[PDB]
Amino acid sequence: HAVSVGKGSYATEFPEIDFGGINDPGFRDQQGEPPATIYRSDRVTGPMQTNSWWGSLAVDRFSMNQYPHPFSVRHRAEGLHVFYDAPHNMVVHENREAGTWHIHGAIGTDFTIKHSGTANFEQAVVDDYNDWYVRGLLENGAHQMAITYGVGSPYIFVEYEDGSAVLDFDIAPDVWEMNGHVIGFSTHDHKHYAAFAPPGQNWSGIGSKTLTNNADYIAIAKLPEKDGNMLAKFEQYAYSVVRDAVADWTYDEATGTVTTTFEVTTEAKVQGAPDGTIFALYPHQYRHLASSSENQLLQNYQYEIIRGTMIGLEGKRFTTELTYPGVLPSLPDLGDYDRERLIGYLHDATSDYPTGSDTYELGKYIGKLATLAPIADQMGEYELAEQFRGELKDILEDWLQATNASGQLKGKNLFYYNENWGTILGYHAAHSSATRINDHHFHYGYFVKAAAEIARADQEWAKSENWGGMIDLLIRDFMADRDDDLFPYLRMFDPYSGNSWADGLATFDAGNNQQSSSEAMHAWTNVILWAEATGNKALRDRAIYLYTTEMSAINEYFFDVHQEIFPEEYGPEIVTINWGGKMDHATWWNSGKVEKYAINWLPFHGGSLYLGHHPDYVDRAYEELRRDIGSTDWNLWSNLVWMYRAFTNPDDALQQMEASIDDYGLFDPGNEKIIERGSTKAQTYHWIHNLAELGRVDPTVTANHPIYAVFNKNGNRTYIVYNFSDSPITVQFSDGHSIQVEPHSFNIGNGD
């Protein structure tokens, strides 16, 4: 009932859960499994994809509302409803007492794509998928309608079995261009679309509420404008149905460049149809478009969506280019702190304990210990650092074993492989990590942090035959490569939307969502560190690709650093939860003002420096939070605000820290006013004093190795490298600076 993996194991039978005498129904219901029923055809076998923009198609009989931008769509017994949020559908609402804001559209229907033979389909199943498109199959015996659609596709491709095409409207549309087999039309409220059938198959019902075509293939396009030249361009690719779509990437270690090429492969539905499509690019893509793709832009082809303006680009492929900025295992010892005061805070942290038994609360605790251990090493407190790492080893050697001393499955503190979906689940579970396959990057990222800190000091422990095998299993669950026997590809990540999606099932009418983008960035950071420590180049590079891409989406959709995406009337300077179809300044729990910003900053670690790349943003966001609070009396998590403020004004951060850090004493789970429960006084004091000495993050300098950071204080650069190798290295920076680094050390600020 368990599979050995090095010294560890995972359960292959669902354990008899030890509830610990807790009767709370919510807690008990968490210790379960994801849904038994998966709505997929027999063409889709093996580990099932989860955490996707389209997931509600797999989980609900039909689907919930989905956002294949620029459209929204939903499957129903009667067919596929299609919608586009026009400006008149978009609203920005504020609930002052709740402190929440919501940017959202409507769940309406512009028309329904129907099958002539039935309006009572039995179910809609996933019939195929690739990196960002899905093929949904509405089924009723011989009657079938296969719908191919995707984020960044202004087409919906429709294939019929045993019937023909129907477009049904509640109010008769305006057919403003009638080319026989191709029509340009607008809804009563002036939304512009087109429909395409093979030559000779002419549309009927023009002027009525129901447009019909005898063809067994049609495509729908959202048109950017009521424009016959655009209609003519959409005709060129309307018969090229996307079958394959891959996002292939490379990391150039010398330059830091992460290059991603998005390539489709299509199947021709008429003779001579080109192999290509029209893509709709999101801001995080087109702002980084490779020179070589520029000639494919369709300049005036714009769509407004929740994430700003999408633009059209034609052809088989396009490429984006991003810059990986490095990460560190920890800030080094470069601050002007009182070392005895910091040593005292390190000892104070021995009082801390996890505030729950589930993967998330245990995760926060081990992240806390892993953050303290290098600081203890720096202060010369090696015995204390060893105590922290020993505690990490004790916790991980427990959780990474599924059996007890007698060889029976444990009832808690273990991992289990759900074969139905194909996912590793940890018990105790929380935040629907097991029942909805939620948040695996957020939770398991902390387990990887703990393992990476152990590996930094003890390479033996981290070997695959020891505890490394189980760590690499957890990593595969949340970010597997292609053709993994146990897990779907890159579970958490949507390579086209550019971000992770936290909900395994996506059964919301706003599509999927992600709240803590920083806990996603923390997961990617820790995989980079773990992979560097254990000599796994392929895994490291995949995590670099994720870190760097996710960063591009965070800066657009969570922060809107360019002040182009959020509506002018939206008050806050952050979106807390991004959805497929809407944006909230709100949290998944009842919180105050600080938390609706800081949930996208925490935890602070050696990969957090991406938060400081846009100093005008950091100032604008801080000042807005300060305005709303009305002072620097933060309602909760004060230390996170001080650490954030230190990115641009460490003098201010320092004065706030000095005034309040010692307000309360040792760890108290009931009181997060000053110190957030995943944080410590030691971490806070070490971070702010390091920033005070280093100055600003400098993202204009790259290096030819991946574990580094560059800071700039009034034109004076500080270069930091950590070397995980047994051998000395030389690191070349993009500004001409060159340094040597000894084995298993920082170049500067090793401490002692």
Ligand SMILES: OC[C@H]1O[C@@H](O[C@@H]2[C@@H](O)[C@H](O)O[C@H](CO)[C@H]2O)[C@H](O)[C@@H](O)[C@@H]1O
């Ligand atoms: O959707 C991902 C997020 O899910 C959150 O839990 C949700 C519950 O709070 C709510 O009552 O029910 C929905 C399902 O309808 C749950 O998804 C977690 O708390 C978040 O951590 C998670 O990212």
Ligand SMILES: OC[C@H]1O[C@@H](O[C@@H]2[C@@H](O)[C@H](O)O[C@H](CO)[C@H]2O)[C@H](O)[C@@H](O)[C@@H]1O
């Ligand atoms: O401060 C006590 C409150 O903490 C909340 O936990 C938050 C998580 O839900 C969220 O996923 O992460 C943040 C940051 O780690 C946590 O503070 C509980 O949900 C509340 O019920 C609790 O009162």
